[PDB]
Amino acid sequence: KIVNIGAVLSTRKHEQMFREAVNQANKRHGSWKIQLNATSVTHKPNAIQMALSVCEDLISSQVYAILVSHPPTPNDHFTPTPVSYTAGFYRIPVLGLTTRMSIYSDKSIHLSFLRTVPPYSHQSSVWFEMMRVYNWNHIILLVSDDHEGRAAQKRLETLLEERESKAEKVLQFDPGTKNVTALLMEARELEARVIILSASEDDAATVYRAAAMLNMTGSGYVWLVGEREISGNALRYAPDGIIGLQLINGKNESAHISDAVGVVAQAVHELLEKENITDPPRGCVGNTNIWKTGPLFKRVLMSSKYADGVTGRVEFNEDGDRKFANYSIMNLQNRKLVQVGIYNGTHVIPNDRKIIWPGGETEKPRGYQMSTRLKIVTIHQEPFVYVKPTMSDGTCKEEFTVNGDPVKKVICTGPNDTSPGSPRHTVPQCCYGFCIDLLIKLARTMNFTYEVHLVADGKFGTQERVNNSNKKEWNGMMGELLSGQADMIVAPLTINNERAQYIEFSKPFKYQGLTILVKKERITGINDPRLRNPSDKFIYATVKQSSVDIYFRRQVELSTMYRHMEKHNYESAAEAIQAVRDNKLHAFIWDSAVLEFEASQKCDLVTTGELFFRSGFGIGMRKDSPWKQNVSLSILKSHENGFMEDLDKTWVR
């Protein structure tokens, strides 16, 4: 039994190296009777003629495995495709030595394909590690629209989703298209200062020139790119201080040939014990069935720890890709590509030199540039946020407390519009109260300026399925905070699990619960049989798109509760209270903090039962906002000294 392997090369000289390497491999092994044989063929220009060349010689001979290399001149995924298809027809394993494209990782297209070199997509992994090293969280994924960009983005998103994080935004750059300036203009607005690029040489050069035009290469920014973006045309126009990376061996054909023949021989020896070896198809013509042993040969070849190779230990993952690697990190320091570290496979190891960031700084920059002018959204809640009309001169009535203290007021832009339906005019008013006083204290403590505006639709916000679609989208202050119109929510927003997945909540600044308001006392909580057996006799309702809606919708035990509620929800809390007092609605379920104040001030109404959902009000921010801790600390401090007691006494008597 003579086990023959084959190779398709280009240089006509590396085939002699492959013959030498296979001869050495034959000189060392368990058995020496298999008489390992080798054959080789040079590359052909025509792809169809190339595939026919694979069918002849290689396939015609009794070959067990095929190796394929790539000519030095970059031609991308064009040369190994025909041999991969032809050998995958018979499930004959094909080992790639220099190709880097991720299209060959898809086992649906290329069935029997393994590679000894990681693809371009795997680079994203090291980026994650770097993001762990420097604690960067806000990133932008500027990736091409081709398969490579989609694969890199998908892998990075998978890694990020394994952890608790998410990329700020991705930007699809269509290959070969000029004017990428729109994407850079969009990315300049965002808070993230870490730019990640995945594109070819021409695309990388184009985006580098466009970013130089937009001055996005200055101080504070961080650029992380791949191998294709620090070579060829890209390196010429690349801005200084970018951090790229490159594989250690990369193009050392001889190392990848020796390391491949060693593992192939080890695999052959390993599976030869079980025998049941089926001879190869012996020619494309005269056979239409796959080689039966082929699948098992590939399966045993994938799990083969050949830890004596030129390029280190060889191991393959579930998709037939070389598990580990070593990436050298490159910095463009004064037009020179200097090495500053080596990625062992799980952690980057910095040994010598110092990273020079693009702005010229010698100190690690944080990955965000939080602005000073802060847009803050708020809603109209009577005990917390009083909204009053401003006089014709642009400021509203001056007022003082009963004790004799000046009431601080700010200017806000609310939905006041004479036109019916939606708000069609944002006429300014003046806002004050508990939340605005807290906001003023917070802004004084944290040294930032603010612009306060009211929510567009008068709702707190729950995610709901968008019309003519199947996905759910947020609305209200929730939607405006997530979209970007507002940067912080200072309002009585109830903390709950649904909102905490997308919004970051500070420490609660007001503990409260949910209670029931009726006319001025035969209701005990939400467990009374009348409230468990809905009917026209006792009607109960809440505010649409609020925390109570979410609470009842997320309860399996209270489905009928929400079913009855859905028929009578109200636009706002104030109109619901007015309807209840006027004997148009029987019971109104709402927060204790507001309901108790309404019952105390306006009287003629009573709160019944004990609080059945204890929660707190919190300042809402975008996910992973850098200044969450600040605010939380301040809130805790306000609880400690005297501030929340004074705010309670002054506003909610």
Partner 1 sequence: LELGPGGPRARTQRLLRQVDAPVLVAYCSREEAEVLFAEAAQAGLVGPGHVWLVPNLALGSTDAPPAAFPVGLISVVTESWRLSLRQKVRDGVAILALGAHSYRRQYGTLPAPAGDCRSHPGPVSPAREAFYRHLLNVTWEGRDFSFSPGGYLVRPTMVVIALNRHRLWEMVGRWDHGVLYMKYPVWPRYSTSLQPVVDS
Ligand X SMILES: *[C@@H]1O[C@H](CO)[C@@H](O[C@@H]2O[C@H](CO)[C@@H](O)[C@H](O)[C@H]2NC(C)=O)[C@H](O)[C@H]1NC(C)=O
Ligand Y SMILES: *[C@@H]1O[C@H](CO)[C@@H](O)[C@H](O)[C@H]1NC(C)=O
Sequence ranges of the binding site for glycine: 492, 494, 499, 547, 591
Instruction: Select from 176, 218, 389, 642 the one that contacts ligand Y (CB under 6 A).
Output: 389
Residue type, 282: R
Instruction: Give least dist CB 411 to ligand Y, A.
Output: 11
- In this chain, which stretch among 252-260, 278-286, 293-301, 569-577 interacts with ligand X, using CB under 6 A? 252-260
Instruction: Select from 135, 468, 470, 535 the one that contacts ligand Y (CB under 6 A).
Output: 468
Give yes or no for a contact between 413 and 489, defined as CB atoms under 8 angstroms apart. Answer: no
Q: Is 2 in the site for ligand X (CB under 6 A)?
A: yes
- In this chain, which stretch among 288-296, 323-331, 387-395, 601-609 interacts with ligand X, using CB under 6 A? 323-331
Q: Is 307 in the site for partner 1 (CB under 8 A)?
A: no
Q: Is 452 in the site for ligand X (CB under 6 A)?
A: no
Q: Is 293 in the site for ligand Y (CB under 6 A)?
A: no
Where is the binding site, in residues? 492, 494, 499, 547, 591
Q: Is 158 in the site for partner 1 (CB under 8 A)?
A: no
Fill in the DSSP letter of residue 232: T
Retrieve residue 175's tokens. 């290959």
- From residue 347 to residue 386, what is the string marking binding to ligand Y with x (rule CB under 6 A)? ----------------------------------------
- Which of residues 403 and 470 has its CB atom nearest to ligand Y in the complex? 470
Place of tokens 């081709």: 146
Instruction: Give least dist CB 417 to ligand Y, A.
Output: 6
Tell me how far apart the alpha carbons of residues 332 and 217 are, in angstroms, rounded to a whole number. Answer: 13
191 SS3 class: coil
In 277-320, beta strands by DSSP E = none
C-alpha pair distances (Å), 522 with each of 153, 515, 579, 584, 585: 59, 14, 19, 18, 15
- Which of residues 301 and 523 has its CB atom nearest to partner 1 in the complex? 301
- In this chain, which stretch among 46-54, 319-327, 384-392, 423-431 interacts with partner 1, using CB under 8 A? 46-54
Q: Is 467 in the site for ligand Y (CB under 6 A)?
A: yes
C-alpha pair distances (Å), 270 with each of 266, 277, 297, 333, 637: 6, 12, 10, 49, 68
Instruction: Select from 27, 33, 48, 604 the one that contacts partner 1 (CB under 8 A).
Output: 48
CA torsion 585→586→590→593, rounded to 10°? 110
Rg value, the chain, Cα: 34
Q: Is 274 in the site for ligand Y (CB under 6 A)?
A: yes
Do β-strands 464-465 and 336-343 pair in parallel, antiparallel, or remain unpaired?
A: unpaired
- Which of residues 4 and 426 has its CB atom nearest to ligand X in the complex? 4
Do β-strands 348-349 and 450-454 pair in parallel, antiparallel, or remain unpaired?
A: unpaired
Q: Is 427 in the site for ligand Y (CB under 6 A)?
A: yes
Q: Is 237 in the site for ligand X (CB under 6 A)?
A: no
Q: Which does 556 bind (CB under 5 to 8 A by kind): ligand X, ligand Y, partner 1, none?
A: none
Tell me how far apart the alpha carbons of residues 198 and 173 are, in angstroms, rounded to a whole number. Answer: 10
- Which of residues 16 and 49 has its CB atom nearest to partner 1 in the complex? 49
Give yes or no for a contact between 588 and 517, defined as CB atoms under 8 angstroms apart. Answer: yes
- Which of residues 314 and 548 has its CB atom nearest to partner 1 in the complex? 314
Number of residues binding to ligand Y, judged by CB under 6 A: 10
- Which of residues 416 and 630 has its CB atom nearest to ligand Y in the complex? 416
Residue type, 3: V
In 3D space, the residue among 562, 652, 555 whose CA is nearest the CA of residue 599 turns out to be 652
Retrieve residue 349's tokens. 């190891």
- Count, residues in the chain: 653
Chain residues that interact with ligand Y, rule: CB under 6 A: 274, 276, 389-390, 416, 418, 427, 429, 467-468
